[PDB]
Nucleic acid binder design. Structure first.
Lengths: 465, 450
RNA sequence: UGAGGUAGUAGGUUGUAUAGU
DNA sequence: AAACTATACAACCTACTACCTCAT
């Protein structure tokens, strides 16, 4: 009759040296770690997007509540919750007509119209950042629905990703300028419905989620840092080894393994893994040939030395595959003797659903099942007292952790993984199931390989979400 | 001397701004005191407000709320506030707070807006800095700001029935252990006694072709009914491997390694489960890499097994709970079970479109909850058992496999207090959140559902 | 959020068309 | 120059893995 071990929720730091266990609540009470002067956003596209964004800005300046504060907390006010300048004026607006859009809509190639309209967006924003002395922190993208429907790849009247956001952010990361894409129906749900009348984008009682997500995303892309870890050991760092398989049709895919320098802050000094011409997409063994392996490890070591003034005492590798001996030896001849290496991996295909016998609330967050010293189960999604509810759907599915090789206590790495889950930044959610190294690994390995025109990625991390 | 700050708000309509402003003020170094922090249930209201106005309150703060302006106690304490303003001649004592925009200049009573009102109708940042500079103008004695005790106050007042607790709790998984494995895993070397076009899956007992041998649990004389040339095969050539060596892992020969033996055991377990529950007259659903199965409507009495709902009617389609299993030999000799629901129009044929099946699966997913999933799974497994403790797997004419009907129940050290059913409606609310978060090419099958 | 629905090897399986001594 | 019975891979069977989509 074995037992399940419980791990307490991490306390993330906040303003004036205070620690709480909720990002929404902690932002509401104290505020961010750093205070920004104020930001001046800008819209692109049509004037309809400008006016609906201005209406949403005037609405978000006012406080907006929800059905209850038990699960989704308050929004006191943008100036009251972050202390930054945000008004109706000083927003740059640009005009994009539909005559050229109407003429190029009748072209037989969807990809051609996509290329021309994306080039229009890109050269317009580069022109705006070129001849204008005014600096824009976050650019805002609003797109109409006619282009969204009549110009789809599957609609009926290869190294570039077909999704618009990925190649937008790739070609803007090549130009090192931040932007954020919102569909028109995302925030204009007041008059956005279907032919029946019911709002598909139902946001009536639940505007607090939109409020918190938009505010936190804008503040993170502003350069400010909302929260930090409470208890962390200097000398440790989190290598989230991306191994997003690249699927550019019939082009040689091989391996484009990226990594994250999640050392002490939310930013990641990411270095793009090469196209990596060793073997083919049939390289399911998923280890690392020594040359690029020690190249990536030396890049990570130099990044940690530049960002922390000292060599790291221990490095945690977070991947999604299994590891073997030769890549570990390749990592070992470039790790110093006083350092240690431990490989942790995250997978989904192993199923185990824990059920609740009595009660009306499911298995929790923070519980864990240990099989041996190297492989265990961890429950990050599910019920949580912090919202009195369950974040997951139906019965939560866990993440199966495997220490592939290396000496590490399972409890300490368990705490590391759940704090890393507690570092979700794109939206103001409580946390997510797998560590944000894996979620943001999908993000950076799906936007990073979206274009072939980039050589060296920027060190900053705000140009990714 | 007076240093206290009180919020006059309508409970429980305005716990929001009261909580936020009180915690911000207590984090700014100013002593605040109100109903939702201190005045809990069982404490008299008006006498405490009277003594705090007459002795303790420096600046009075009243939230202009819809229902908090009509109570008798608030009128009594505002009357005693006017009395104490007549006492020591302080006409700036009270502060009007504008939160409810529905209330205009005329809806507020006679004794509030006769002095100036602080602006709060646009945002709250300028509101609390205006409160701070009013504090500085009247030289109220204050403490240097520190949010540590504010965080402690939030911790002990807003996490009472709201944080985790220490008490035992019992759980159960979807893993079902194998009680007993086959004694001998026998490799049958038929040599020429196997036809070339023989499909191995057609055998009545599980078997896997391995080099020239046949990996199977069945005896040498178990395939007589379909192979008339197995009379001539002697019983001494086929090698026997004890399954205890496979499970313990101490078996390592040049013929078959230990992991290959375990994979063969898992494969034979899956084949045996498929054939044995195909024997039990359970309908089939075509899955891509697995096999989904559903219970035909009307086979079960009342559509309940031990008074547990298993198949039911919603709108026009019939929903049938079903399971799919894959053998897993890593953690223990167990069998994992997936939880599915299979939809039919009438109970005979399947849906022709898979998107309809997925939409129905989600729609019935929100309608019930994890507890109903637990009873459905338990009823399905108990119906899959003929005796009271195990399911009767078939691998040979004389050797069987036992798998326990009851799942592997676990338990945890800590648990939580259990609130009412409103938070399940909030789980439906976050289902709406998942509806309104992402969407991709939904229109065609949504308009095809009629 | 995650549960389907899709192919990739996925690691050992038995037949394509050479030269070993 | 030529007799045995293998070469010396590499194609189609199959459990562990591993992709864009649906509708909430």
């Amino acid at each position: 009759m074995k037992e399940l071990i419980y791990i307490e929720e991490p306390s993330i730091l906040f303003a004036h040296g205070q620690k709480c266990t909720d990002p929404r609540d902690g932002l509401a009470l104290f505020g961010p770690l750093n205070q920004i002067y104020g930001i001046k956003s800008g819209v692109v596209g049509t004037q309809k997007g400008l006016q609906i964004f201005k209406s949403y800005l005037d609405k978000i300046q006012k406080p907006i509540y929800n059905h209850n504060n038990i699960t989704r907390p308050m929004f006191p006010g943008f100036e009251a919750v972050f202390g930054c300048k945000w008004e109706s004026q000083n927003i740059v607006f640009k005009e994009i007509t539909d005559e050229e859009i109407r003429r190029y809509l009748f072209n037989a190639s969807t990809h051609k119209r996509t290329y021309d309209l994306v080039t229009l967006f890109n050269d317009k924003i580069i022109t705006a950042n070129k001849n204008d002395e005014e600096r824009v922190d976050v650019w805002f993208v609003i797109v109409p629905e006619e282009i969204y429907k009549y110009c789809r790849p599957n609609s009926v009247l290869y190294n570039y990703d077909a999704q618009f956001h990925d190649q937008l952010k790739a070609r803007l990361l090549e130009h090192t300028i931040p932007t954020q894409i919102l569909r028109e129906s995302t925030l204009a749900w007041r008059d956005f419905k279907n032919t029946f009348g019911a709002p598909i984008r139902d946001f009536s009682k639940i505007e607090g989620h939109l409020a918190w997500t938009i505010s936190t995303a804008a503040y993170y892309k502003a350069g400010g840092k909302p929260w930090k870890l409470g208890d962390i050991r200097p000398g440790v760092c989190y290598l989230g080894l991306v191994y997003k398989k690249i699927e550019k049709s019939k082009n040689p895919q091989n391996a484009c393994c990226a990594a994250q320098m999640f050392l002490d802050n939310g930013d990641g000094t990411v270095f793009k893994g090469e196209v990596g011409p060793w073997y083919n997409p049939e390289k399911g063994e998923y280890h690392l040939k020594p040359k690029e392996a020690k190249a990536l490890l030396t890049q990570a070591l130099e990044s940690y030395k530049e960002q922390n003034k000292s060599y790291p005492k221990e490095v945690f590798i977070h991947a999604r595959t299994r590891f073997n001996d030769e890549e570990w030896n390749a990592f070992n001849e470039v790790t110093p003797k006083n350092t240690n290496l431990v490989g942790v991996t995250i997978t989904k295909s192993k199923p185990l659903k824990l059920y609740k016998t009595e009660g009306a609330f499911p298995i929790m967050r923070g519980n864990a099942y240990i099989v041996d010293e190297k492989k265990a189960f961890l429950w990050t999604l599910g019920f949580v007292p912090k919202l009195q509810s369950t974040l997951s759907m139906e019965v939560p599915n866990p993440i199966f952790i495997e220490i592939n090789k290396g000496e590490a206590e399972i409890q300490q790495v368990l705490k590391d993984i759940l704090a890393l889950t507690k570092l979700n930044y794109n939206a103001c959610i409580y946390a997510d199931g797998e560590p944000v190294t894996l979620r943001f690994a999908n993000k950076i390995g799906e936007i990073l390989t979206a274009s072939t025109e980039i050589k060296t990625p920027p060190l900053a991390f705000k140009y990714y979400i | 001397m007076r240093n206290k700050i009180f919020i006059s708000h309508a409970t429980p309509e305005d716990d929001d701004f009261t909580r936020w402003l009180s915690l911000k003020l207590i984090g700014l170094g100013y002593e605040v005191w109100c109903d939702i922090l201190f005045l809990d249930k069982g404490v008299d209201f008006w006498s405490t407000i009277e003594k705090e106005i007459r002795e303790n309150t420096c600046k009075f703060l009243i939230v202009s709320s819809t229902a908090g302006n009509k109570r008798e106690g608030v009128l009594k304490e505002l009357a005693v506030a006017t009395k104490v303003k007549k006492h020591l001649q302080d006409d700036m004592f009270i502060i009007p707070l504008a939160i409810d925009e529905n209330l205009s200049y005329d809806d507020i009573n006679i004794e509030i807006v006769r002095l100036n009102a602080i602006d709060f109708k646009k945002s709250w940042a300028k509101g609390l800095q205006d409160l701070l500079d009013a504090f500085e103008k009247q030289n109220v004695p204050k403490k240097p700001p520190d949010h540590s005790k504010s965080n402690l106050l939030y911790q002990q007042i807003f996490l009472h029935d709201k944080q985790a607790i220490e008490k035992e709790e019992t759980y159960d998984s979807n893993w079902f252990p194998i009680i007993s494995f086959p004694n001998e895993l026998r490799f049958h070397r038929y040599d020429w006694r196997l036809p070339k076009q023989f499909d191995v899956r057609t055998l009545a007992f599980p078997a896997i072709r391995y080099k020239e041998y046949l990996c199977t649990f069945a005896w040498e004389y178990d395939f007589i009914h379909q192979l008339p040339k197995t009379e001539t095969y002697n019983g001494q050539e086929s090698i026997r491997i004890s399954t205890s060596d496979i499970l313990s892992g101490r078996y390592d020969t040049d013929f078959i390694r230990n992991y290959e033996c375990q994979r063969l055991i898992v494969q034979l377990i899956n084949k045996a489960f498929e054939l044995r529950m195909k024997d039990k007259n359970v309908r089939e659903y075509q899955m891509s890499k697995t096999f989904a199965y559903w219970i035909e409507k009307g086979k079960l009495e009342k559509d309940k097994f031990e008074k547990i709902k298993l198949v039911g009617k919603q709108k026009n389609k019939y929903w049938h709970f079903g399971i799919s299993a894959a053998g897993k030999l890593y953690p223990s000799p167990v069998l994992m079970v997936s939880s599915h629901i299979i939809f039919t129009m009438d109970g005979i044929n399947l849906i022709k479109s898979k998107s309809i099946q997925h939409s129905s699966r989600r729609k019935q997913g929100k309608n019930w909850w994890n507890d109903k999933w637990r009873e459905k799974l338990l009823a399905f497994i108990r119906f899959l058992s003929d005796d009271q403790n195990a399911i009767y797997l078939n691998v040979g004419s004389e050797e069987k496999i036992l798998i326990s009907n009851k799942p592997l129940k676990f338990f945890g050290k800590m648990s939580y207090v259990t609130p009412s059913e409103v938070t399940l409606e909030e789980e439906s609310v976050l289902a709406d959140i998942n509806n309104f978060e992402e969407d991709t090419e939904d229109l065609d099958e949504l308009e095809d559902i009629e």
